[model samples]
Target: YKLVCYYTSWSQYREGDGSCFPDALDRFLCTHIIYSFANISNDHIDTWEWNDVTLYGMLNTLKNRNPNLKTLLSVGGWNFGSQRFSKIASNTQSRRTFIKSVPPFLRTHGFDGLDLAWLYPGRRDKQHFTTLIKEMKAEFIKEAQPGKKQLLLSAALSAGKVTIDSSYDIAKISQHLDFISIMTYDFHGWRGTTGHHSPLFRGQEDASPDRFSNTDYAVGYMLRLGAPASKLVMGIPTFGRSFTLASSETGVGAPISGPGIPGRFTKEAGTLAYYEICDFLRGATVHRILGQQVPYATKGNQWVGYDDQESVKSKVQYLKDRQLAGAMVWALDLDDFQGSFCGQDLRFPLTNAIKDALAAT
Candidate 1:
């Protein structure tokens, strides 16, 4: 399995920490990195001096220490937002400006490739978003060196149909990039009255069955939309969204009384991100559902909907059955660290499980 781990530019990663890199490096087959926001100039960019020197040093460390790792710089995250991309990517001349600047940026930093994480490309700005992707492809190919033709390009896209249809001309876009990472998490949360942000299946049998509320459904939707199975990389969130249940609710998403429950962005709280959830399972309580092949759990009124070894294994089987591309994680930093709130180790569990699943297939 191609196990991709994401890291933000401001992360404080220990050089040789057992939990950080040394432990799971050898366990997982292949690792890809999505470097968040390499272009911001003020406070956000200044948080970590992301110049050529800083990026080059980090890239060199990974390339030297972990030969099997492939690191790609991802532009635009949820917080960063791609408001400027519309004007920047629309014109051919401006697009060339971006492509020309990027190669030297990579060569200067010793990085491998780039991943565009433009959040909601055409939702508000329609024409420029699609034009930008097209321009990037055209300019990238034109400026690409003959021997350096292997530069991998990928995009992290929203899993909604509106975004899929308006932002990406899949047939045209897929021809330029390597693989697309489909974010399959974040369906349920306090945002909704009651719902699993990452439910494996909808318990409501009477509701509209056509709607997708889980990992498999998201993947299936992509396949149905003309994205090649082999090029579709399923997304798994490190954190699970939870809601306060005031009464008996059959479905994951329903309204309740009491207090509205909020999810933690990190594992320090009782809830775990995908990476930390692996550790939570070691001692945490579990609730499983058959056929759905996924599970959820709660502690002290905090409800969490997430996946486990069994769920991940089932997902891998589903990937094999569909012949889709390997899995890519939202991040690696959320894993359980020694002395962390969740005492269980998560990095190794998920990595080893994925490796085993891939080998079995």
Candidate 2:
């Protein structure tokens, strides 16, 4: 089973060791570590992070530690916006320009592949999205040498049924892509009422669209839509979605006033890095979600829902039961890389949980 970890460039700006530089990554922890985001400049891949060159050098250098390691340069994120992607993929000429720029860019920067994380393409941009992936795969194969591996092509896609249907032509893109990362987090982040963000299975209270919100539904939806299980990688987050409860009452669907306070390190109001959550749980009352291994916690008016070791292990069981390819961590930086927090007696408790479970397989 493959363990693909995303290393976001923005993590470099986080406070203290929360600022994860490429060199800090555990070389053996992931089979693939995709550097998040290489933006488009003049219709070609451009480094978005200020220290990309330096970070790339360090990230690629990890290959020396584990020759089996694979790194992909991921381009375009939610923050990068769909407009930039539409401009590139919408036109044949511009699309080819972007596609042609990839092979050399990946090889030159020492990446083994490219991850197109276009956020979610528009309704009209669906065909163009597939075209971009198809041409890139063709180029990768065309440029391959007999003794060398061809550059890999993958897409970080949506988990929501609405976004998945609107954003991808599954059977078509699956043919050209090496891995389809189904982002299964962020499902319940701003629901007004607190809910599990990445539940493995649906809670009893779930209805309609929410019934389709959990990881099981997302993975099954793709396979039912014609994606092969071996090519699908389910996303597991290293952070939790949080909220400020409106009252002392805390449950799966408790009323929330607004986003919870920002993490001292992550600095994101509505979310907490697993490390930040370590502190949040000091005296917190925690409970398991109904009919799922996922957990939600409450301390004062703060509410947070996240996965723990058992929950992640259960998902690994879920991954194996479904015969899926592997797990993809949304990020490496958000975990307790410092090895100090989350009370798990280790850094990357969430990551290690997935790694150790998949290790046996």
Candidate 3:
């Protein structure tokens, strides 16, 4: 089983001195750590600043503490968008340039692999994506020599059925990847009516025809579509999706006009880290949506849906029972890494719960 955690480069600047950098990580907690993002210029990989290279070295140094740990450089993200990927995937020359550039760069940085986090591929870009993976895998094999380690290739993929069906040839893509990280969180947030952000199962109260919105539905569909369970990693959000209710009434389908107030530390309007949510839960009324098997908390008009130790334990057991690869946290920094907030005794409690649950299974 692999416990994968994403380490965001910019979390070092979050407010309230709550930021967590690569150096603060507990190297033993996870099997693999993926550095959040690296930029792409034209058809080649590029860095945003000179400090990034220095930080890359610092990140790899974690391996000195835990020789069994593996690291990867994640390229592209939701913020980076898909334009450059669409351009590169469409042209043979661009794809070739990208494939040729990655191994040496990863080698220089002391990374074990590369993770393509291309938010999504459109319907038109589906075949192009497969070709890009095929070419990249070929290059990875070609670059391997005697006594040297083999480079790992993986991708962070969409959880929505619409996106998955329209944008991926799952069976083909699976053949090339070491594993596929399915972003199973964010089932509902920032738009439309209120709902559980990462429901374990589709709630009986859910009225949408899109059954693939929940984690269980999404993972089951992918397996039915030929994705091997062992090669699929389920994503867990260390944060919660928040909303501002339009009235006093609140439930899974409450009416909301906008996002919840910005978090003091995270500063994102519609999101709150587990620590922030933990603080809110201290004074808020907490409730669980029965059929969905997730929890939510509300105070006045501010509402948030998130996972706690209990929810995370349930998810870990679900992964074990389903024979999935393992659980993946969207990030390591968002948890109460410093142990200064969310109660002193419960530092990294959610992550620890996952670890404990995995051990029991």
Q: Against the true structure, whose TM-score is highest?
A: 2
User: Model 2, residue 320: what's the lDDT?
Assistant: 88
lDDT of 3 at 309: 81
lDDT of 3 by residue, 203-246 (tens): 77445435777899889988998889999999988899888999
Tell me which of candidates 2 and 3 scores higher on TM-score: 2
Q: Which has the better lDDT: candidate 2, or candidate 3? A: 2
* TM-scores, one per candidate: 0.80, 0.97, 0.96
Model-by-model lDDT, in order? 0.60, 0.87, 0.85
C-alpha displacement of 161 in model 3, angstroms?
A: 0.6
Q: Which run of 10 residues does model 2 get worst, by summed lDDT? A: 202-211
Residue 349 error, candidate 3, Å: 1.9
lDDT, candidate 2, 83-146, per-residue tens = 8789889878888888888888888889999999998899888888988989989989987966
How much is 207 displaced in model 1, in angstroms? 5.8
Alpha-carbon shift of residue 43 in model 2 (angstroms): 1.0
Order by lDDT, highest first: 2, 3, 1
Choose the strongest candidate by lDDT: 2
Clashes of 3: 0
